[PDB]
Amino acid sequence: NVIDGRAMIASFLTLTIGNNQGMGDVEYAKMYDFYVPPAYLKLFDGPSTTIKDLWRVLGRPVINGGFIVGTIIKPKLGLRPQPFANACYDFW
Amino acid sequence: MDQSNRYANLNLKESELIAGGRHVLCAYIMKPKAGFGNFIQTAAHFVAESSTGTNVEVSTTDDFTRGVDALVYEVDEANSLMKIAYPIELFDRNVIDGRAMIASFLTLTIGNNQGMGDVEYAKMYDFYVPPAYLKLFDGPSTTIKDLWRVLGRPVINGGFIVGTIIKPKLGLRPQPFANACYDFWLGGDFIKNDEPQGNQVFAPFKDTVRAVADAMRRAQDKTGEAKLFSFNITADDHYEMLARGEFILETFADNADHIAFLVDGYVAGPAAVTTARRAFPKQYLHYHRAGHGAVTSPQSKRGYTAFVLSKMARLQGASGIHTGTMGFGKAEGEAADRAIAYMITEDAADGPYFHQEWLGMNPTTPIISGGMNALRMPGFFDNLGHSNLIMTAGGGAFGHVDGGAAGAKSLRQAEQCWKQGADPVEFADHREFARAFESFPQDADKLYPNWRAK
Amino acid sequence: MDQSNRYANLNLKESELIAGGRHVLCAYIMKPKAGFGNFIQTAAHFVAESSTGTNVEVSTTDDFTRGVDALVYEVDEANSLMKIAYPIELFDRNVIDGRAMIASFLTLTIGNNQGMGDVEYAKMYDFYVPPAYLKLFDGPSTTIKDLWRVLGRPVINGGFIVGTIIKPKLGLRPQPFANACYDFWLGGDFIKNDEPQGNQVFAPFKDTVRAVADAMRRAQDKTGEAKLFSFNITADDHYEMLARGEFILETFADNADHIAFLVDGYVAGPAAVTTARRAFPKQYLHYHRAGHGAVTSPQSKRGYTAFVLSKMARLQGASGIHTGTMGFGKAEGEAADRAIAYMITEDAADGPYFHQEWLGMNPTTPIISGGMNALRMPGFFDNLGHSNLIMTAGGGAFGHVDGGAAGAKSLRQAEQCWKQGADPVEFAKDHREFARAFESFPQDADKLYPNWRAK
């Protein structure tokens, strides 16, 4: 980045797994692993928020706060706002 | 008017108030002014002027209001001690993101009550914040770890960061400034703007920033080690802070993560701190507390102590704050101030009155500064117990007889001396350290009576 | 280290330093701590720690640095007096617009020197700013003139603005709060949030603002007179302040120029004040000073006085600032504080040590508050000499036996009483609301008017 000198995953992708995926003389190629050294590693954002903050909100230990019971609202689509909220209320 | 029946309930148990998690607790040293009400009456008026009331009865008051009254729950007149519990519902919240603000905490706990005519003085020594309120504060986003990471040090116990402040405080033009930076960086890690340095007519911000960036590159090329700089971005105007920070990070480019931002947090206020904390969360936030001594001094019996200031600074999100030299330097301070550092570094710690759990909130680095030099550090480290911190010595570094680089190396060797548990005079097989005796002979005379003989 | 030869020059003349216009002057009351240097030595170190130096010599110093040194030019050890001249080149300037910042003034003039080990205490009592530096400060953009204009009063000597603070300080939910506003506005002009009122969970910001706006509409419809409200928009976060101000002005719409923004300037700091000043220059900026007493109190020998704070607030761009009751209310204060108001209202005025020309910088309103009521007002006006100001009485209004409206009217009648030059007790015979204030605060009545009961 010009603005803050930090890294972008887009360049990593463009180079390591970009045009080489269209090569005519290659049948196939797939990346299974990659290593980033400290000088490059330290330039990525990394997570700023973690599960600890959810544990904290839940009143759990912020280290090994344990299992967070979750769901996804189903139907995937079709519930109008209040039925949606009713399903939310019920699960909660 | 006696409001004790409403605002005082001494039968409440601090342990229960703590267990409940619905109250902020504050401990004050307060003294009524002669010729008014007694201690509990005065404490009651104090609570009234600090929460829901005034100096007379008003008809608009209802029971819901009485429900959120702050209350005096503990007093000890012999020791002028007074503890007050504030329901957390009192404290203001951001409309935009529902988070807490220290400004409300200040307005309520140590605001108007500092102007009361019937009170001679009242000063805060400690406070407790329960989880529901604690979790609403920003806390630090960047820590000393990121500096260690940049320096190539271990991110756990990465050790001592040798720092300095550019002296003169003001007066250096851009290139001489950058030259002193280059010189110190040959032997040291860290350099900060002196707190007032910025965009003086004789040292324009952008020219200086460019020259220092060049100096950083030259120093890193010369030494093969990473170097850090803390730039002052303090301003009245939010957008000026933004302009300065943006220019700095863009200008430093691939060294942008070598940059810290200094904010004069006490005089410019929490708003500036928050501007920096929220605008540049990925840059070490260096809280400079210039002016604090007007209230934190033991000579003062009003306002709040340095301990309170530091704990607030940890809540506001400072990556580091000056905690003072703890009696070992030129500023007012005590050895017991070691307790302040522990309060800002640990996940759990004891204040003078309240125990505090931090729930994994990031630590704030204790920055040690104020008349320090190579000779004075061994005593300081002995009192604190560790060297996982940043130390800046302006005069202590540039006042070295052999220049800034030797000063830096003298600081480095001084810390190596402390970690080896060696005797300073005997340790002083180390020229730069030894020359600090000659640099500051009065100090040398005081700390090591017969250093000359040896 | 003795630094007197470098940082002290007692041969300098104050009149020439003033005439030169290249120096900020500051007057301090300072005392060295026993067991260190003498007065001039300590003053020299004080200057060193407040400009270009430190506690020891450094090889990095050049002649240019020595050229911009601050200097002690006057001392009086018998009276603990110390005066320092700061070259204006020292003070930080904005990159974006080249304007001054009070934060730099503070960092230098009253910053680190408050932590010095060889000083027992030091307190700033006055300061002088020359034209070249003065003109770089924002100054107020809106004044009491604009409230007078909104109220339909003359924009010159528009007279007394009757105000209150919503009490309880905290605890009222949106509609009861708005009900109290409506009640007061039937007899008064101006209402401010109490300083901590904002977005408490039991009183959400937007609901309260909407309810108050409705109360304003109803009150203006009821009285056929314009009403004013001062909303607290203080926050740590700049963008929260913006969000609050923007919501208020949009919500009040055609009554938007009836709105002032209150900022807790001392605890939140100059940045918040400046946020409001620069983001909303067309809205009256109401500077609230909660916490100042920690340093401004005469019990304190550190920091700065209320006079200094007020003069700074005028520089920062406050439309009005609280100056205290000058001994007539519940807070610590003296009659001589009348001098502060003059400093913030006039184009030229005298401080305890320095005369200040303001060169047409807008005035800042003295906002009077702290345990005031109708009975105590005549003496305050007698001491001050005018009523061109805003006065807010929370307990004095809502503590009135007949409620907020009668209290408001009692304050109104109290100022009319002072302006008519009438005897209060004789005046009370023909003005019920004023008279009921005697019964509302009988101890105040007993002290101020010994035999009011017989009459």
Ligand SMILES: O=C(O)[C@@](O)(COP(=O)(O)O)[C@H](O)[C@H](O)COP(=O)(O)O
């Ligand atoms: O004098 C100064 O302004 C310093 O640069 C120290 O320089 P020196 O090392 O040359 O003395 C620091 O800002 C103070 O230590 C801050 O005070 P504190 O830490 O107490 O808040």
Ligand SMILES: O=C(O)[C@@](O)(COP(=O)(O)O)[C@H](O)[C@H](O)COP(=O)(O)O
């Ligand atoms: O909370 C209060 O006490 C007030 O609302 C006054 O209420 P009352 O009218 O009922 O007394 C004001 O904020 C103080 O006067 C501020 O003090 P100052 O102006 O001196 O800075």
Ligand SMILES: [Mg+2]
């Ligand atoms: Mg400094």
Ligand SMILES: [Mg+2]
């Ligand atoms: Mg108030």
